[PDB]
Design a protein around this ligand. Structure first.
Ligand code: SF4
Lengths: 120, 43, 457
DNA sequence: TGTTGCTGC
DNA sequence: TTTTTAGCAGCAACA
């Protein structure tokens, strides 16, 4: 809605904003943000092996891990916690969403597709 | 303030190693008939 | 430290609902351990004791440095945290000197207790239809960044005690013993006792009935402008003699003098002191040969530093270390490596061993041998010449009995670095800049040499 | 009985 | 270090 509102072609009567639907699907842990933060605080008291090789420091704290490794350890403890408290590891939900397809936007992608289709 | 001289030497060494591999590739290509053609000057 | 003492009291009062069932799932503090840190002698232990007693807790003290049996202590800590004491009052555990526990047993037990209580609490909060920690723990350290404490820190509320509290305590003792002591004489007694609380109380009791070698080194570089230089000299002489450790004081002076400010004309002062230091080394060698009559002159050499380098500018204490013990252990390790190489040469090279002195091996042979192994074989386009050099290098590695070991201590299956055993690198490579350049070049050469050794095998 | 994993469509 | 997507069958374990 922002980039469409910033566009000088956005007048009363505009035809170039084609609205189309899609169905988003989440898979999430039943656990809430307070429970996530409780698991994060629990992991901050644990110690982790350094994926370091010829390096030396053999042990890291949680906050000394890469953010990707922190989230891998969080997801592991959240799978155990969610199974223990909610009797399921995942919830899945489907939400119908709407997005704006600009018709006035520079044609290079679609021209490649039309042109490629015609050459075939 | 204590390592600014050791990064320049390694890049010249890597560029020399890559030129030496490129020479070996030019020798192999020429053995296999792929002589490096340079076109005539045309004004 | 009144603000700090009120914070400690505030943290202990957060335990009151869980322990005493008084109204200000168990409403306990989020951090279950209190960690006190700061300099020695400022009253860390005394503050922990007074605030715990003031809060209605019975205090149980454990010195963590003396208890060399965490796994056994375990029973003591578990009894003190989870069993009812015969006393009407709930127990508070005070762990002193937790940074001195060389064996992580005590700290592992505390971490295991905390993790067990976190698991027990989460079961009480989220468990659909385990000993909970009901007692406060106070830990005291001198150093917060000690490696042993890294696992405990996340569970701790950290409180810094900065550098009066001793004066207040001694005044309270004087008032209870009905002693009318002027506050000036108590300060003079505190200064005499250097903040030793036991020594202070004994000196007070005696009145009622009627120098770290480092401190000496820093005093040897200080001149007081308000006192006679002769009186200062005799006071320092008596302090050096009473310490009996003239050697350590001198080694301290030797490490400090280059960093000290001294009016410099041409840095001759250092030349005069090299002759004394040489005189001390001769005297120290003679102490093992002759009955120790010469020990009386050992106290004079440190005092030459006071005469030559003592200045009013030197108001700050320079901290010091022991480079010599590390250099002696390194020299021993390097000598042992060299002795092992010399034995290997004696077993293989029948004649080489007759021409190789220990000094010639270290300064001539090993640096050239390492330069030959570290040479960039990637610059050699001629495969035959590369193969011939590699065959000669394999023969040299065999003559010196140098084994290529794959150090697989990487741990993550990527690049187990090849190392030479014995490590000639530790003896030859003095320059830290050359170490990094040589390590990268050697890794590719050693893999090629290992492949050739395996081909020959 | 349902979910979850994995392979392979 | 290079790397298209989602929907489904069905064997086997376990919540
Ligand atoms: S071209 Fe697209 S972004 Fe611009 S005004 Fe029209 S709808 Fe909005």
């Amino acid at each position: 809605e922002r980039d469409c509102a910033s566009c000088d072609f956005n007048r009363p009567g505009k035809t170039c904003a084609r609205k189309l639907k899609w169905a988003w699907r989440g898979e999430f842990f039943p656990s809430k943000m307070d429970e996530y933060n409780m698991i994060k605080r629990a992991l901050q008291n644990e110690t982790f092996p350094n994926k370091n090789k010829f390096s030396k420091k053999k042990v890291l704290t949680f906050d000394e891990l890469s953010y990707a490794d922190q989230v891998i350890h969080i997801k592991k403890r959240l799978t155990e916690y969610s199974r223990k408290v909610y009797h399921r590891v995942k919830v899945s939900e489907i939400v119908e969403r709407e997005a704006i397809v600009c018709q006035r936007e520079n044609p290079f992608y679609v021209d490649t597709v039309k042109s490629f289709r015609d050459r075939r | 303030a204590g390592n600014k001289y050791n990064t320049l030497s390694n890049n010249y060494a890597l560029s020399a190693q890559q030129l030496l591999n490129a020479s070996k590739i030019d020798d192999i290509d020429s053995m296999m008939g792929f002589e490096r053609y340079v076109p005539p000057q045309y004004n | 430290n009144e603000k700090t003492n009120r914070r400690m009291l505030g943290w202990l009062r957060q335990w009151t609902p869980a322990v005493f069932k008084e109204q200000l799932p168990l409403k306990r503090p989020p951090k279950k351990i209190l960690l006190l840190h700061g300099p020695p002698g400022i009253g860390k232990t005394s503050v922990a004791h007074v605030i715990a007693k003031q809060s209605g807790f019975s205090v149980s003290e454990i010195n963590a440095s003396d208890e060399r049996a965490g796994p056994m202590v375990k029973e003591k800590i578990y009894n003190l945290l989870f069993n009812h004491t015969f006393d009407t009052n709930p127990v508070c555990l005070v762990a002193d000197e937790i940074d001195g526990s060389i064996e992580s047993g005590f700290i592992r037990i505390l971490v295991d207790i905390m993790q067990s209580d976190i698991k027990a609490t989460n079961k009480l909060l989220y468990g659909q239809p385990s000993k909970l920690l009901t007692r406060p723990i106070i830990c005291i350290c001198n150093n917060l960044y000690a490696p042993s404490l890294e696992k405990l820190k996340p569970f701790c509320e950290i409180i810094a005690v900065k550098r009066t509290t001793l004066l207040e305590r001694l005044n309270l003792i004087c008032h209870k013993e009905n002693m009318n002591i002027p506050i000036k004489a108590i300060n003079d007694l505190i200064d005499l006792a250097q903040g030793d609380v036991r020594n202070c109380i004994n000196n007070l009791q005696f009145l009622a009935s009627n120098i770290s070698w480092f401190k000496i080194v820093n005093q040897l570089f200080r001149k007081d402008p308000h006192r006679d230089i002769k009186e200062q000299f005799y006071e320092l002489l008596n302090q050096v003699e009473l310490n009996g450790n003239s050697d350590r004081i001198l080694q301290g002076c030797f490490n400090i003098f280059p960093y000290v400010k001294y009016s410099d004309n041409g840095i001759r002062k250092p030349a005069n002191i090299s002759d004394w230091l040489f005189f001390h080394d001769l005297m120290y060698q003679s102490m093992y040969a002759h009955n120790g009559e010469l020990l009386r002159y050992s106290a004079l050499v440190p005092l030459v530093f006071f005469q030559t380098f003592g200045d009013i500018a030197n108001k700050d204490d320079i901290r010091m270390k022991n480079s010599e013990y590390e250099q002696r252990e390194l020299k021993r390790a390097n000598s042992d490596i060299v002795s092992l190489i010399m034995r290997h040469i004696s077993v293989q090279s029948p004649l080489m061993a007759s021409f190789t002195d220990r000094k010639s091996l270290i300064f001539e042979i090993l640096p050239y041998l390492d330069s030959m192994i570290s040479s960039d074989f990637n610059k050699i386009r001629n495969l035959k010449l590369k193969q011939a050099i590699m065959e000669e290098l394999v023969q040299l590695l065999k003559s010196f009995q140098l084994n290529l070991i794959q150090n697989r201590s990487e741990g993550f299956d990527v690049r187990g670095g090849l190392t030479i055993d014995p490590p000639i690198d530790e003896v030859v490579l003095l320059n830290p800049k050359h170490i990094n350049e040589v390590q990268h070049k050697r890794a590719n050469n050693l893999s090629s040499l290992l492949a050739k050794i395996e081909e020959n095998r």
